Amino acid sequence: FMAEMNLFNVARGNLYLVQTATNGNWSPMAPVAAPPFVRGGPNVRVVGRFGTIVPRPDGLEPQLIDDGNVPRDIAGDWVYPSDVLQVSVAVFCDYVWPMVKAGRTRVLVELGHYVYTLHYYDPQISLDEAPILEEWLSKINPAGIPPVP
Amino acid sequence: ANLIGGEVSAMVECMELCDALTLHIRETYVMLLRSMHQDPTQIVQIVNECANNLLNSTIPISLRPTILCPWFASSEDLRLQQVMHLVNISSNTAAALPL
Amino acid sequence: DIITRPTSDSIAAVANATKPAAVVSDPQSMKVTPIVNPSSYVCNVCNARFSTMSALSEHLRSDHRDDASTLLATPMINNAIRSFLTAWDGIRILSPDVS
Amino acid sequence: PLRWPGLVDPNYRVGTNDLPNRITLYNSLYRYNFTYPTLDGIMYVRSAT
Amino acid sequence: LLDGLALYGDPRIADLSAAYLQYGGNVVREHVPPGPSHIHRTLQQVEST
């Protein structure tokens, strides 16, 4: 099973979230280029164990608390352990996710294995993947998560 | 005008019909209140510590010049308060059970 | 007002002849959703959700007014804690008594 | 005049008074405009792992 | 608030203290001298004037 888990709709490895506007081919389940900002890479920050956020006054934009218990600037690269997401999806959906859609930040979701699901589309007509993800986020809670689309 | 909160000053210094004795009382009462003042920013740490770090919290607050949060009490006050509890109970020790 | 002598017909006819549409129905659209969700509005200091900008504007115009509002004495003084919001499920808890 | 030094004395310091001996009727003082905040907060729970 | 001092025992208090006695004859006593009062000061001033 550990060698053929894909046949049971189970995938391994982490999940990335980067705004990509492609015109040609796309293959999320079999990437060709090396993934960016592997954990421990330069300027890569891992969220704190509470996933809390702090506001700032008069123009200064909020900051996120890393594992070092230090507020950090949201823009850049970030790593989310799944559990932190499960307890802080709301603040993520309210502050981090918009920055992702702006392409000003990249997020790596750490989760060893997970159930995935697919959705096919016609490559000819226009499409935007954001609503599907936004729905998927809306159904995460401290208890469990829906399969990755 | 000093420390103008946009339109209005935070405190003023004026001279008017006023007897010293009453003024002396009023000033001390202010001193008493300010002695009870607590810095609000420390609340979040108080919460986090009291929660044994099981909770992490944020409480934003604006910092104006004149701001009063009479919530602090020294250990002496509490210790005295505890002793007072024993005294008021002394006639009927059974009254402590509801605790 | 100011006079608005209409222009010559021929010029108007020529101008009206050349008027391409502004928006067309093209399947290919490279559509892009809004960056910020327009369906809900949150109070940036207490994170209360709202359905419209007007409702949110009033809430901060009431609940988050740091005015030195009254030169007359305030009728009431509130307790330290008014409310808390649990992030993990978006439930707001009200102090059993803030007044 | 003894009860009105703060009004008719050219050598009157601000806020001074001989309280233990007699009572003056006209004096200088501070009037305050304190503010009484209320707190609304957000609390986050620690992750499982 | 303060009734026990009047209702029971001698009201002529000096400085409150609580203690417990161990069988070994050792006595552990904890005094509770009050912190700096403010009303008391101005009251004494009022009496003086």
Added chain:
Amino acid sequence: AQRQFFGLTYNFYGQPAPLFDLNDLQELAGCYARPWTSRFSHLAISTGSLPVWSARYPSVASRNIIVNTLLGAHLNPFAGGQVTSHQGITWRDPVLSSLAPVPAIQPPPVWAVAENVPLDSNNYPTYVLNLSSMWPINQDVHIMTMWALSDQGPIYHLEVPVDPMPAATTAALMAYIGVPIAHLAQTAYRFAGQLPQSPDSTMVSTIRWLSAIWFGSLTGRLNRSRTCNGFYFEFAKPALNPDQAVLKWNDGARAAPPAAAQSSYMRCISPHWQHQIVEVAGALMSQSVTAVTGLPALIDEATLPAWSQGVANLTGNGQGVVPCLDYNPVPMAAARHLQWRQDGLITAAQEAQLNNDYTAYALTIERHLTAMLVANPIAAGRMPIQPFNAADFGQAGQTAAAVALAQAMFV
């Protein structure tokens, strides 16, 4: 009220131009693109106790440093008597409300780049006419000057008169029981900021005493066993909340007034101040008083860097020249702990522990700053943090003299 001031711009550290960029000019915490009355806008609303800093503002002092450098390029009217422009940006109006791109109607002359230019308000007559609205410029310019004169840490002034604290001040002081030093500094900045004030004022004298009291507590000379006038500053354990020192009033013993009037200039001699809030707060608070009252006397040039030698209205070596002392926080903490055990607040075992804790805490400050410096080399174009050398963390300076002054000051 005071109607004239003097000042001096920053010094380029070998670089050819003032060390800031347009984005800095675009991201000030106050009103859009105005440097005045903005040195606290980044923390007007606060939560928690964590210091506030960011990638391009990585130290608590960083924002003020940038503001100081920014002002250095646009204060020509107080030197050349005329408004100028730099890189196509100038003031909106002669009142200097804020900065804006130059209009294409009557472009002002381009500013000639220079450093350490002396300043005199009398070079710009319109300031006197519009004093009621240009008042905050006085405070900020003075603050910039007080930092520019030092290569290592802001300079500020202390004094204590022979008379006891006047009653009027005591009435004002009690409003500030139980408030931390940082908040007080913010209040002090606002006071001298908005409207012109007479040098003689209950509020002015009040803040002056506050500055003296805090220093007395800083050395540990003032504590709950020996108050100034019932007042003193409380301290938390350095291992946690090392900066939440607050003001307290107490009914205990009072220190007797000094034999003669005491006054001196003070400075931090180690880079620690750049990321330690209390140094900034204390310096700004004292500087605020000097801003409204002017400088009591010229400063001694002897211990100052080269560019500060002999500034016209600032430094001198004559007779009426107040000396300037400097100190290092770590030995200062050691002295403060020693006072506490001598006064009997603590046992020697605790005193040993406190020194270990503080030294460990200070080490992190050094480690943070030194790593941050290489991340922001001064040759990049902007100076978020002031350059230093590793040996600067070990200098003891005149710390021994400093505590001696406090002992002579409160007695």
